């Protein structure tokens, strides 16, 4: 009794809840950075460890402390439900990634550090230095089996 099963959960717009759009440029909120996709140890045919919402520094190193947080990685290559880039990049390659920096209202429950740990309260200060709002007022949702 085993069947091949796949699932999808979320979307892109649940991380960047709101965004200020400038007349002059529609792309002054973001910043493109050069990021390593596959580590230098894992063989070529292995899934990437990054995910949408990982805090990264300017130098492309995924954030590990509140002192290095610079932006949120929201590139379209790591959105949920893609899974088709396995084995396309050999280990150690460096690929551009789109970060989101300025003029955003960002969810907190999905922002995480390198290892998946939640964002520290003192890490919010660094992210709001760029002029962004970290909001927790998310209604959420409740599926079958629940009352209401």
């Amino acid at each position: 009794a085993k069947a091949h099963v796949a699932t999808l959960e979320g979307n892109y717009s649940d991380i960047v809840l709101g965004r200020v759009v400038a007349f002059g440029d529609t792309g002054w909120n973001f910043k493109e950075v050069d990021m390593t996709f596959i580590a230098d140890d894992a063989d070529a045919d292995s899934k990437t460890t990054l995910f949408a919402g990982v805090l990264v520094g300017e130098d492309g190193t995924p954030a590990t402390a509140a002192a290095g947080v610079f932006g949120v990685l929201v590139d379209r290559k790591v959105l949920p439900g893609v899974d088709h880039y396995i084995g396309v990049f050999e280990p150690g390659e460096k690929v551009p990634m789109v970060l989101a920096v300025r003029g955003l209202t960002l969810n907190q429950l999905k922002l995480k550090y390198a290892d998946g740990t939640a964002i520290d309260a003192a890490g919010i200060q660094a992210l709001e230095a760029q002029g962004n709002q970290v909001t927790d007022k998310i209604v959420g949702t409740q599926f079958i089996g629940s009352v209401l």
Binding site: K137, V139, G140, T141, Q142, F143, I144, S146, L148
Partner: protein
């Protein structure tokens, strides 16, 4: 009929039997019938709900 080589009997017919068959479940028609074309099938599921709004 004949008994042995010289005598006779009286032949009185045949007996027969056949066991029971339980059709209870099939009678009340639970299962729908869908004639496929191959030996693999796929089923998809989707579900949505609601939330607990707060005040500001």
């Amino acid at each position: 009929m004949q008994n042995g080589d010289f005598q006779i009997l009286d032949y009185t017919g045949l007996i027969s039997t056949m066991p029971r068959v339980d059709t209870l479940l099939q009678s009340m028609n639970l299962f729908t019938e869908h004639f496929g074309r191959t030996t693999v099938a796929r089923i998809e599921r989707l579900d949505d709900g609601a939330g607990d709004i707060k005040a500001v």
